[PDB]
Symmetry: D2
Subunit: 252 residues, 4 copies
């Protein structure tokens, strides 16, 4: 029992979660802290929201800090990581969960739009990974939040966003090979339609997404956080280089 | 806490596990019973082994029954399911875990070999699913054990086995659509090299498999059982139609 | 020029095409004969249709024979192959194109339905492959016709058909390993909605399929035949173990 | 006959091929010109090599121009495209074939390395596509050269390169949706080990790659050019959003 509960536990692990101020990232930072991890979560400008996530985690008995780090700035990410390490003792779990949504007709998409989507969706995860990777040891975890649009693109208008997430899945396989011999697993979780600010369960346009879902409704951030928390702990030890889609069957 | 532990729990659920006498199947039947499920497990002729798995589950505080049901015989499977339902009260979780291994040079493979591999690897899961499916309700779970050879075939000699597992993944997507509106999730877990009788961590031929693994060693049946148990419970509710590979990175 | 036209040519090759009496199979048998292959095509009971395909091929200057061989009967397939070899001189190209469509609510699908779909969709291609394989040499070609439903299942009701085609893709990878060292390529082509008797470009239900297609219309049997003919010839030599989807973007 | 040869022909089409000075790109520019396309090919600094490819195409009876356009500079790409259009009359076929190889231990990979790999491997194809796309009409073709490392990463050291190619496959699906209603197909071809300057059929390290190949040897640039030429012409009309792997079975 208590042995299987040792199976679930993250006590003594330090997590770094980008995009921890809201939606999926905040739900992950909370679930990781619920299982015992000390959590550093980052935010770009939403200072108050990030502090309130730290307060919720403290109220439920956990430990957390909010650090300001603009994902466009590699130095800011690397400093945030160094700070986490110094303040919380080490770094055992990295979760990349700071993606931004983008949608527009191709005829209205510029080269600056590509540059902007990639700087945050694709380049900022690589920066965090390459820097977290000096600190991680045997038992370390890297989990990236992708999208089910990484595998299947049903609509026009979303090439940049879809591509940024497909790139992360390809980066994930190659990083699993790099970090495997050190005992670190590297995986990517692909959420489907999840009731958030970025993607409200109320349409407009919810219906097109909702229609796809085999089990009939949008999921919740908590669904994604539970898969991340399972991967982050001892039971995820034989999963690496993997893509795990959690999308209600939209992609079936 | 206790709320998240409600998150993990299978108390009150009845599971039916094919191939529960050994390897992965026995580890799943035990982990499901550890989380509270009452477990019916089936076996073809290994009566003593199946009874000893039931005894281990009883000793740790759970409830289980062993039922004889030859996977080659559709009627035997359907009877086993009817029996489970009558004895244990209903049926909430189906796990298909009775695959057999097959390997041979193509020039030595007969049509009878195809027929034999498929009868047990592919047809027996469909039979169990179609029969379990009258009994499952909102919250039901179907989980099939596939193989990482379903997605990637690195060697000659294994076309039948690989194909039988790829067929199950395609059956899984279509069944997720069928059973989704009823609130049932249908997924497939693809284990890589797992230290078992079917696949001993000692070579011959272990090395070719071991070399592929990013994290450097064969996994254990318990690794697969923990992913199955997570999918089987409340935290798996937004995962369906999915393939989940748990193979140490062999497929990266 | 003439060198690139040597690039396209199948002169001197013997092809065996199952399902050559109609739709995709007939278009393939004709395109292969147009490029110079002598073609044996099989049929189950549509004797007149198969003879008229042979007449069309003869009128355009090619050579072809129609052989009766029920795909449910392994001996009939193997005899048809032996006959082809004796009458046409050898066997260089196998195309499996005799699938049957199946669709039904899961609650109305029986074990006999599974058995029936698989006997023709999955087992009959393996039988033809295992028997053609003694005759093929360096430069040989195996091409199977799958379906885009092998990779993506958007609807309920089609689990058996989808699974039978996913099984063929997994069989294809393993057979590519088996037959590679002999210089034989083994591939699978996945057609999307193709204007045929099995799938008329006129709805009912055409619209649901048509809506998916990125380029806006159903394709034609000739589209599939041109990809098969390209794979069958010298330019396909470095393609093997591959899945090639030709579906107007339905699966994007 | 001549009708099927109309089937193969690119007469009257203008192609723009990045990386046309060498390896795969030069073989594509030549095969496209052999089938009748007028070809603009680009190069970054290898002026002499690019001119000699133009001379070979002229000697065999075709039309071609070499244009200098550094793939790091979006304006240079867009100018090259405007020039092609003005000099050759329009633009019907875009082939992105200017990737660079990158390999290094993760501990020696910098953020500047990521930036550099992506600027050329991922961003330069998007720039060319977004600019070519005003000029393409019904019947237009976009073909990108990816890598089989986009789907399967067997080794450490290649995360950036693999990711850049996986990103292109995800961009391809989304662009197929964008450009489909206009009658333009968008596909990606994934070459495996192809005997080039970038990847010589002589080891060091050839052997690790060669061992994977089901048919036993490295392919040739001409193999890739023949699949590109087939996609570029009328017979590719029902293929779009597709990934086509041409790798001798390495990925099976």
């Amino acid at each position: 029992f208590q042995s299987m509960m040792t199976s679930i536990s993250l006590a003594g692990k330090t997590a770094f979660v980008t995009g921890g101020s809201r939606g999926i990232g905040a739900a992950i930072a909370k679930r990781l802290a619920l299982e015992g991890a000390a959590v550093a979560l980052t935010y770009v400008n939403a200072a108050e929201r990030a502090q309130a996530v730290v307060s919720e985690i403290e109220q439920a008995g956990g430990r957390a800090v909010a650090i300001r780090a603009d994902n466009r700035d590699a130095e800011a990410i690397e400093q945030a990581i160094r700070e986490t390490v110094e303040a919380l003792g080490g770094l055992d779990i990295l979760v990349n969960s700071a993606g931004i949504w983008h949608s527009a007709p191709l005829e209205e998409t510029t080269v600056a739009d590509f540059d902007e989507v990639m700087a945050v969706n694709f380049r900022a995860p690589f920066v965090a990974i390459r820097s977290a990777s000096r600190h991680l040891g045997d038992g370390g975890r890297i989990i990236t939040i992708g999208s089910n649009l990484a595998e299947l693109v049903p609509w026009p208008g979303i090439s940049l966003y879809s591509a940024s997430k497909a790139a992360l899945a390809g980066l994930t396989k190659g990083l699993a090979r790099d970090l495997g011999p050190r005992g670190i697993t590297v995986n990517i979780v692909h959420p489907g339609s999840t009731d958030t600010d970025m993607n409200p369960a109320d349409g407009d346009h919810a219906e097109a997404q909702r229609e796809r879902i085999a089990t009939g409704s949008y999921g919740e951030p908590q669904d994604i956080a539970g898969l991340v928390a399972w991967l982050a702990g001892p039971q995820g030890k034989f999963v690496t280089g993997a893509s795990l889609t959690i999308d209600g069957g939209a992609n079936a």
